Amino acid sequence: STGSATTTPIDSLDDAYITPVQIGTPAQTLNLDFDTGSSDLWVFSSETTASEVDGQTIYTPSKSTTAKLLSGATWSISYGDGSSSSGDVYTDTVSVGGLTVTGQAVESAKKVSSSFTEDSTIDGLLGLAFSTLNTVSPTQQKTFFDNAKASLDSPVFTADLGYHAPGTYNFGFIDTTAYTGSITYTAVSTKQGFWEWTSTGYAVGSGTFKSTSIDGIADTGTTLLYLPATVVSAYWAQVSGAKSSSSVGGYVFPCSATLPSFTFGVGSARIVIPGDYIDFGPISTGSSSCFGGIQSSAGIGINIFGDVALKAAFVVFNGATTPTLGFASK
Numbered sequence: 001s002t003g004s005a006t007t008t009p010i011d012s013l014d015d016a017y018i019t020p021v022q023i024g025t026p027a028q029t030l031n032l033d034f035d036t037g038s039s040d041l042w043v044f045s046s047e048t049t050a051s052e053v054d055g056q057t058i059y060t061p062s063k064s065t066t067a068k069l070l071s072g073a074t075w076s077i078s079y080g081d082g083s084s085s086s087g088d089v090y091t092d093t094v095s096v097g098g099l100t101v102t103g104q105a106v107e108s109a110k111k112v113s114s115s116f117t118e119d120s121t122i123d124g125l126l127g128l129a130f131s132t133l134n135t136v137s138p139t140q141q142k143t144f145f146d147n148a149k150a151s152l153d154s155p156v157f158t159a160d161l162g163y164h165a166p167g168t169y170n171f172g173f174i175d176t177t178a179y180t181g182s183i184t185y186t187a188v189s190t191k192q193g194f195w196e197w198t199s200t201g202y203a204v205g206s207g208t209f210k211s212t213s214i215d216g217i218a219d220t221g222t223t224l225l226y227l228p229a230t231v232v233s234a235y236w237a238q239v240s241g242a243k244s245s246s247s248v249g250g251y252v253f254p255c256s257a258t259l260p261s262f263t264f265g266v267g268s269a270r271i272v273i274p275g276d277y278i279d280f281g282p283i284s285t286g287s288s289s290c291f292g293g294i295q296s297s298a299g300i301g302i303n304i305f306g307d308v309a310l311k312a313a314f315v316v317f318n319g320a321t322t323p324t325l326g327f328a329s330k
């Protein structure tokens with residue numbers, strides 16, 4: 001089997017991407033944030049605290065003939081940005097882009113943090129990291145990809161995120177029309193539950209390439225690119241008037257700037273992030289200070305190849321017995 005679904009930016013800055021997901025019988029379609037950095041499929045629901053729902057579409061398990069309470073199971077998750085959600089668990093039929101999994105754990109939110117409530121466009125998350133991170137207790141549950149894997153033509157999914165434009169998530173096949181050149185594969189560590197890999201270095205603009213190992217995760221559910229402070233300082237030093245602002249919480253730059261590109265290494269290959277991808281717009285409406293898309297990972301404890309990096313590539317999440325990542329230009 002295969003599946004193919006379009007993923008759409010939630011706003012003009014590509015803060016995140018939403019992908020329609022069919023849950024239950026008859027189908028209830030919710031727009032979920034596909035997150036290769038987490039392993040819970042959770043949704044706004046008929047159980048969510050009413051004051052914490054503001055425009056999201058909800059899953060109502062009592063309207064699904066295939067929904068079953070997973071008796072005793074609860075979940076609770078915290079994300080790297082301080083946001084959180086928690087609740088109970090149903091099993092139900094979940095389809096993505098024509099690919100169906102029966103008996104998928106659908107984690108129903110009783111509580112969500114203010115950032116989730118305040119984002120009307122995201123109805124929940126679909127985790128695509130390794131199932132070892134799933135938070136369901138006392139019986140840990142599998143991701144949608146882990147449940148689908150054995151049925152798929154090939155045990156892979158691909159992320160093809162757009163710049164200010166829709167893109168695609170494919171499951172079970174590699175669309176050889178969606179990228180240029182060849183796919184370079186690189187080793188993954190699953191020891192922390194993430195798609196963790198080692199970049200071979202970076203360049204700023206037309207600068208020389210610096211060969212240096214950068215351990216980090218491929219995380220579709222993080223907006224920005226978070227790298228070591230040395231690398232980030234080297235990037236922003238090429239932008240007149242850029243600075244790290246403790247008040248704003250990262251590097252800002254004059255909105256009048258033209259940003260340089262950023263290149264990262266994948267083995268002997270190179271992925272170039274155009275400068276425009278690094279512009280996250282005014283810090284507040286009407287400001288001439290703009291927020292940077294490359295930020296320090298200092299204090300986060302891991303480097304994160306978030307959407308800013310991944311949207312520059314066609315990315316293969318290879319879930320073979322020894323997982324690997326693939327990157328191609330596009």
Ligand SMILES: c1ccc(NCc2c[nH]cn2)cc1
Binds near residue numbers: 038079125
């Ligand atoms: C700042 C924000 C995001 C992340 N991951 C975000 C996230 C939110 N929900 C799922 N992943 C890490 C640092």
